[PDB]
Symmetry: C6
Subunit: 119 residues, 6 copies
């Protein structure tokens, strides 16, 4: 079977939290007022091989190159998946933004991951 996107979201959140000590939410929200990091799942395509695309949203009061890049690097190093599923590649793909929304610096980083399952 193919892993639910939500399972993938959870694995990234757990990695960010356990490996980076970061507090990341897996639910996308439109209106944001205080600093926060959310993961936004975008789409999925089965190519035993699959691609998931999601973006990391990092809101901060000031430009946070260090934090954004910690996250970027953490994700690129990988994350554990449930038995039978293996992360095979991580790459940047799609929209990368840095914009001022409300009073906050909003950084959006888009990833594509390739995941293999047992056949």
């Amino acid at each position: 079977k193919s892993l639910s996107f939500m399972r993938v979201l959870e694995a990234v959140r757990t990695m960010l939290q356990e490996k980076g000590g970061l507090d990341v939410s897996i639910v996308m929200r439109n209106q944001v007022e205080m600093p926060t990091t959310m993961i936004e799942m975008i789409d999925q395509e089965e190519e035993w091989k699959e691609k998931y695309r999601f973006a990391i949203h990092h809101y901060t009061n000031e430009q946070d190159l260090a934090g954004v890049e910690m996250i970027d690097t953490l994700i690129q190093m990988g994350f554990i998946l449930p038995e039978g599923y293996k992360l095979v590649a991580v790459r940047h793909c799609g929209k990368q933004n840095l914009v001022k929304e409300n009073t906050l610096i909003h950084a959006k980083t888009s990833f594509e991951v390739s995941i293999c399952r047992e056949l």
Copy 2:
């Protein structure tokens, strides 16, 4: 050897989730949701290349609205759909794929989960 209508496919999936899953799912997409619910949204349908037969792809999405995060419920639905559903004699479900938009977003006071599928059916 007539091409199956989308609604027949809607029904096949709804019936399976009810019978095999005990879940109540609507096959009518609603644009204004203000309470938890599970809906199937049909999207499109296309012929697929078939050497030896007639193959067709149907795309639809499952919309799962809940008061809060519900990974257990989302995965239940997701896994049942991938396990397949019975079709009328002459039609063979060839493959069930995640394909297209996958979302987890807050809407007012609901968590909105959206899972997109593409199924291949042969005749």
Copy 3:
């Protein structure tokens, strides 16, 4: 020459009416309040061979699998065209929807038809 889309609309309506006893309108309308069936022409492409794409909109107070599928089946069986033009194929193509609009169940079914003319 190539048949006007409207001529094709008329031939489908006549088929639905004469072969299915259904009352179908060939004019697309946005706001719909009472049960009805309309044909919506979408586009046309000349490939002596041509493709027309149109959708059938079936509004009912309750889910109407029987009615929707009668129509679906009627259309798939074909319809007569003016002399010199022959329907060669009918297939599902594009958006297929089932949505609740106003108080009505709105079913949209999209078709592509291939039509040949004398050369």
Copy 4:
């Protein structure tokens, strides 16, 4: 051997429908219509591959607004356009095709018919 301007093509078509059809047609698209009228809407223009010459595709649409269904009138226009229209010396109308959006829709109190063409012109 200069590429023909869209307006020249607009004029060629308008002139034909008037001269051969006795129809009054505008070459100016209007976004706010509240009475019956026939308009040509120019859309786009592209080079086409030509081995031996210079070929170009022009796309435009005929907008036919009437108080009610008018298949006779729509077909009159449609048939004249497919029969061709004369162009300046050096340019040969190679083909007239239905291509793109074809619509029949109600707008307020008018029936709006839209027919899309692609013409190939060679030089």
Copy 5:
């Protein structure tokens, strides 16, 4: 190096003004009330060879085939560029419109130009 789109805009304006005696603005404006001719740059792609796409907007109180076509012809004949850059081709490409906006006849003509530089 590659020529800035603005440099290309300026060269077309100078050509229209010096070769055609026309008064053309290189700044696109949304709301237009009096007759005018503006150039609207759209996009650019490097293929030593490059393509620029821009549209000419010609607003007049009455249909102006003569004026529109003078411009069309002027542009097709070419325009001079700064040393090291040569216009190699001009062709129609993209949206060509004739619409009534406000009280004015708005003509939009889209061009693609190929420009070569020294290597």
Copy 6:
């Protein structure tokens, strides 16, 4: 051999325009501008095919708002960016291209100039 984050690329460009150009440029895109300013808007990032290495394309746009036409300033920025910018050890700037939307438009009381680039970076 880790893929470079967009922000690192933003910084590389900003730093160059400041150090080599004496220009003050923001790397934060603002949706509501009411005074002259120069901003870099990051757009997207994609892998590029590499035979022998790892190549990646980054796209961004320079937004130059001024009280009036400023060809001198637009060209200054444009030329510096094409001259390149230094990157961290291991990454080689392979090419700087104009690519995508290029605009010169009036917005309220400002002239808004938009220049779109694609850069290829290798590792």
